Design a protein around this ligand. Structure first.
Ligand code: LR9
Ligand code: LR9
Lengths: 263, 265
């Protein structure tokens, strides 16, 4: 993997592995989600840096508020996929990472992604606007003119997700993370939530359709002795409305929607 | 990804990824477990397999994993390249063996070694059988002929009989169940998932203050749709040893038994 000629984006090549694919022998969206995580990490390494700089000074971290993924073709087992990624200021409101996936044999786009990150405090968890000296550390590693994997004005990735109302059409109750769901700081990694959201999609739908789009808001963390319930309801191509909530008091941790095409 | 000069062994290089490491920024045994699986798969393809022979596909026969044994000296750090060599051998009519060496790509030193016992089973009836000469011949031409053992030792902890755990268990993790990321391409629970289930009953205290040196795990039954697992661990003991049992939380049917051996950091 490497920074491009201008050092304002990063590329990496991945070979899809045997345990990385589902029953179509194409990559799961979770594998895809982990390669974006991975390529985003190596791009932080390359520049100097989760990707903190003048943040751990005041005990501050970046944290995913929203993931959005559109897949045209899921790479097959043995296929090389190329992912290019870059980061942009959304002023002091925001901070965005976009990805592009290409077939490394055709150079053709098979998938694109985008995400929103905000400041916190690993301790108090309180949201924080981005200061001047925080935009003087990373904005030298970012494109200055807007560059959007989702350019389209009023599209699928900027719009409000409603809260699923009881009763839910479908549910998988009592989901618990294991140690393999934890990152190196012992937090459930953003990708397990994607897994829990998809767990309440019926097998009939997975077996006959293909996931075209996922959109996931990150509202609260699950703390490895919390148990999640996962709720889905057909809102409709099939579309679903998603809610993850703590098994007990019913506290929201994620809401999302998904969009499937008939195979 | 290539067969060696003599095409009786296969080598692959893996770079350790961010989401593949634990609290020490070194790869988890499960990540190791997955790279051993990935490299075994690429070696089957390399000699033209899928790892069923011509006869096996005809007779609805598959290779199943009876025992996994893994000994790690050093877990490769996030960003480190790791080289794994793997090879198979006839264990006569009983079944096959697959053996792995893990090396550091920079120093060339062994950092781990694994070994496994594969038995032949009917897909459908789920019924073990011995290796017909018709089959032995089809894969023997892809195996070393002189024994080549990752675990040569005259009394190695890879071939020793594992007791069943007596109730009450010292530790337990109750109600474990697979999600879709736990399934392989043919919709069966991935063999690595049981490693993680086994290790869920090891208390955090041990994990935070020791390293896993040795895991030995026998496979007795699989998780066959809607099943829920309980995980049982009891200390059998510098070195902490454990005895392990997985069972279906209903009838209490055994699926796995195992041991682990941890050293203080
Ligand atoms: C799994 C990580 N999550 C959900 C968070 O820590 C979090 C909490 C509040 C707001 C946001 N954006 C994120
Ligand atoms: C998923 C792998 N497992 C547990 C099996 O299919 C199995 C069943 C019986 C004996 C053995 N050795 C393995």
């Amino acid at each position: 993997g490497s920074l491009t000629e201008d050092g304002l984006s990063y590329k990496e090549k991945f070979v899809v592995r045997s345990y990385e694919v589902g029953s179509n022998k194409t990559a799961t969206v979770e594998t895809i989600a982990n390669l974006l995580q991975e390529v985003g990490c190596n791009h932080a390494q390359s520049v100097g840096f989760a990707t903190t700089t003048t943040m751990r000074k005041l005990h501050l971290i970046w944290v995913t508020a929203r993931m959005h993924i559109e897949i045209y073709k899921y790479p097959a087992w043995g296929d090389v996929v190329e992912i290019e990624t870059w980061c942009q200021s959304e002023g002091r409101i925001g901070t965005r990472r976009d990805w592009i996936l290409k077939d490394s044999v055709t150079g053709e786009v098979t998938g694109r992604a985008t995400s929103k990150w905000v400041m916190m405090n690993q301790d108090t968890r309180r949201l924080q606007k981005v200061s001047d000296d925080v935009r003087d550390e990373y904005l030298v590693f970012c494109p200055q003119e807007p560059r959007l994997a989702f350019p389209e004005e009023n599209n699928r990735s900027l719009k409000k997700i409603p809260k699923l109302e009881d009763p839910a059409q479908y549910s998988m109750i009592g989901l618990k993370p294991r140690r393999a769901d934890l990152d190196m700081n012992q937090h459930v990694n953003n990708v397990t939530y994607i897994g829990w959201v998809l767990e309440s999609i019926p097998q009939e739908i997975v077996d006959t359709h293909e996931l075209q789009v996922i959109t996931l808001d990150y509202r609260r963390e699950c703390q490895q002795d919390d148990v999640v319930d996962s709720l889905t309801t057909t809102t409709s191509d099939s579309q679903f409305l998603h809610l993850l909530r703590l098994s007990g008091d019913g506290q929201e941790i994620n809401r999302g929607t998904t969009l499937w095409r008939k195979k």
